[PDB]
Amino acid sequence: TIQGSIVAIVTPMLKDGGVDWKSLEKLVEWHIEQGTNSIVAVGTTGEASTLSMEEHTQVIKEIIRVANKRIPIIAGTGANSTREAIELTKAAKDLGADAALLVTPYYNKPTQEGLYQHYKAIAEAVELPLILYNVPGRTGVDLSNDTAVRLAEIPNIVGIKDATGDVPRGKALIDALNGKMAVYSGDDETAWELMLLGADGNISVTANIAPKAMSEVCAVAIAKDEQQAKTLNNKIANLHNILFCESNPIPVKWALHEMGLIDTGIRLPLTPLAEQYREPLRNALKDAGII
Amino acid sequence: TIQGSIVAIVTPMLKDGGVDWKSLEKLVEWHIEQGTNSIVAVGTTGEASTLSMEEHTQVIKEIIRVANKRIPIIAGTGANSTREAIELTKAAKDLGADAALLVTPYYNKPTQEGLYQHYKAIAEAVELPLILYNVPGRTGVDLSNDTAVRLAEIPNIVGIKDATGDVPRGKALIDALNGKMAVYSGDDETAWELMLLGADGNISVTANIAPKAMSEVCAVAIAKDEQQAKTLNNKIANLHNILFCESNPIPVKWALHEMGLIDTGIRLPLTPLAEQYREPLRNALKDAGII
């Protein structure tokens, strides 16, 4: 039921890597003021991989605190161990998250039936709305549309973040589901299209630096206004591409630093955006009217 | 300096998923008796992903205890967080492992420089021999030959497990290194060829079920006996293929169970080998004279 522009928020860090709580609080407020409809806390863009379990909990807790019930908060709780994903998802439920986002197990390459059992075990273990998340290029596995349609029958599985950027395939999924669960784009470049084709929203990277613009793109696309979606998305289309010059969230964190909103902290193995991309990113920010 | 057949040993489990300590002991002994040259504890094939930190330590400790210095033990200590990789690698050094095997960070897709900094940071934090491990199909990142050659300059980085299965590229890496660090095959199907071309060994899945045969394949290939390497590898060639009919270690654990050496336990999201592949596997085992 969460719809619209859902930012996959970065986890602001001090130069030494520590979580920058003050900047995080200001970012959450800014998103709410600018039109963001929901926030995914500690997803891929939020460096879930390099935060400790305690930090994971604290970031979710702080975002929910600052949001103060004004928008729904989705907690990233994926893991490549079913046992761990249950533990993280239970923690998010106890913290009062509105839903959890669970990327498919990465690296260990479960079978389709293994993906089914993984998500079924978590759904039966924790009474919380769960959103699947498929991003094959990062995980080494591709949760098929057929498996997604099967999982939509499981109570508590309420949606899927489709980051394939394969629009025909996403439309096929939306059509097959016939409303049984939601479909969210996980690909900013094509999100406007998927939303015009029936997706419920965009779990976005670009929304981190253009939250108002993305809120508008999702609103007109969800309203099925093809021309307004095209026109408004065209203004920020180059941002969707440049925010991936190096692996996300490397560019988007640098962008937010050029905007003056967060410091340079980012945890190894990730690195600050390579020096050569900084001027081109600043130009893209200026071209889009962000700085 | 470690050469030959290095088994990426499974972690035997009881039906409920608990570690099967007694079966692990018997396997370690069997490998020593059968000619295996080294064991990788808690690698990919050992389900590192679904073992807890305590279990990761217990398994390394137990394999070291049973091996009693007869063959070197390499501990899998890879993580997608540099801080966690440091901790796991320190623990392995403290437990007395001879070396550590560290897969490239998965899922978060660091840059080549990030991979460089990642491994440099670990090598500088822990004085223990480190073996890189590249398997892009699982991790979403490819540690290039260029980056590997840079890392060979770092004290404590003593080798790389190349699981690409791309022989020309493997040969190019061997030739570029010119002895600066070791190259191990991480692809059973092509390991015999890479060893004939200069690799120091094979960190093998097939060795789990044919330790004697793979130890002989490695020895003759390392001695550059092309005819004997081809002859001996032919006797187990179909095993290299069938052990990947579903994601490793699913098939190998089922093979060991058909051999009567471990029970069926395997942790979600992994699943017991699908029934459709069991007769073909049993037939391949009978063909190879294993059962």
Residues of B in contact with A83 (CB under 8 A): 50, 267-268
DSSP state of A206: G
Q: Residue B46 — φ and ψ, nearest 5°?
A: -90, 15
- Paired tokens of B107: 């899922």
Across the interface, of A47, A107, A270, the residue whose CB is closest to B139 is: A107
| Interface mutation vs chain A, best among B16, B19, B54, B109, most A CBs within 10 Å | B109
Q: What interhelical angle do A53-67 and A21-34 show, nearest 10?
A: 40
Nearest chain B CA: its distance from A84 CA (Å): 8
Active-site annotation holder among B161, B253, B277, B286 = B161
Phi and psi at residue B8, in whole multiples of 5°? -90, 90
Answer whether A268 sits within 8 Å of B82, measured CB to CB: yes
Is there a catalytic annotation at residue B106?
A: no
DSSP state of B13: B
| Exposed / middle / buried, residue B185 (Cβ in 10 Å: 0-12, 13-18, 19+) | buried
Nearest C-alpha of chain A: how many angstroms from B47? 8
A108 interaction partners in chain B (CB closer than 8 Å): 44, 47, 49-50, 138, 247, 269-270
For residue A243, what are its two tokens? 């925010």
CB contact under 8 A, B49 and A270: no
**Structure tokens given for A199:** 């997706």
Residue B200: its H or E element: none
| Choice among B119, B133, B184, B253 that is catalytic | B133
Contact A10, A248 (CB under 8 A): no
Q: What is the DSSP letter of A19?
A: B
- Chain A residues lying within 8 Å of B47, measured CB to CB: 108
Is the Cβ–Cβ distance between A64 and A57 less than 8 Å? no
Residues 6+ positions from B174 with CB-CB distance below 8 Å: B183, B194, B197, B198, B199
**In whole angstroms, what is the distance from residue A114 CA to residue A117 CA?**
5
Minimum distance, in Å, between the CA of residue A35 and any CA atom of chain B: 28
Domains in chain A and their CATH numbers? 1-291 (3.20.20.70)
Which positions ≥6 away from A199 have C-beta within 8 Å?
A162, A170, A174, A182, A183, A184, A185, A191
Asked if the Cβ–Cβ distance from A50 to B108 is below 8 Å, we say: yes
Q: How close, in Å, is residue A110 to chain B by CA atoms?
A: 5
Binding residues of B for pyruvate: 44-45, 133, 138, 161, 203, 248
Structure tokens belonging to residue A230: 């095209």
A274 CA to chain B: closest CA distance, Å?
Answer: 9
Q: Which of B44, B121, B267 sits opposite A268 (nearest CB)?
A: B121
Q: What is the resolution of this structure in A?
A: 1.4
B117/A268 touch (CB, cutoff 8 Å), yes or no: yes
Q: Which residues of A touch B108 (CB under 8 A)?
A: 44, 47, 49-50, 138, 247, 269-270
DSSP per residue, B90-131: HHHHHTT-SEEEEEPP-SS---HHHHHHHHHHHHHH--S-EE
Give B274's DSSP letter. P
How many C-beta atoms surround the C-beta of residue B231 within 10 A? 13
Question: Which parts of A44-124 are beta strand (E)?
Answer: 73-76, 99-103
Is there a contact between B269 and A115 if contact means CB atoms under 8 Å apart?
yes
- What are the two backbone dihedrals, phi and then psi, of residue B195, each rounded to the nearest 5 degrees? -70, -35
Residue B41 and residue B77 in contact, taking contact as beta carbons nearer than 8 Å: no
**Inter-chain Cβ pairs, chain A and chain B, closer than 8 A:** 123
Q: Which residues of A are catalytic?
A: 133, 161
The Cβ of residue A136 has, within 10 Å, a number of other Cβ atoms equal to 15
- Give me the long-range contacts of B235-240 (CB less than 8 A, separation at least 24): B235/B288, B236/B206, B236/B210, B236/B288, B237/B189, B238/B284, B238/B287, B238/B288, B239/B188, B239/B206, B239/B209, B239/B210, B239/B284, B239/B285, B239/B288, B239/B290, B240/B188, B240/B189, B240/B206
The tokens describing B179, both together, are: 């002895």
Residue of A108, A113, A114 with shortest CB distance to B49 = A108
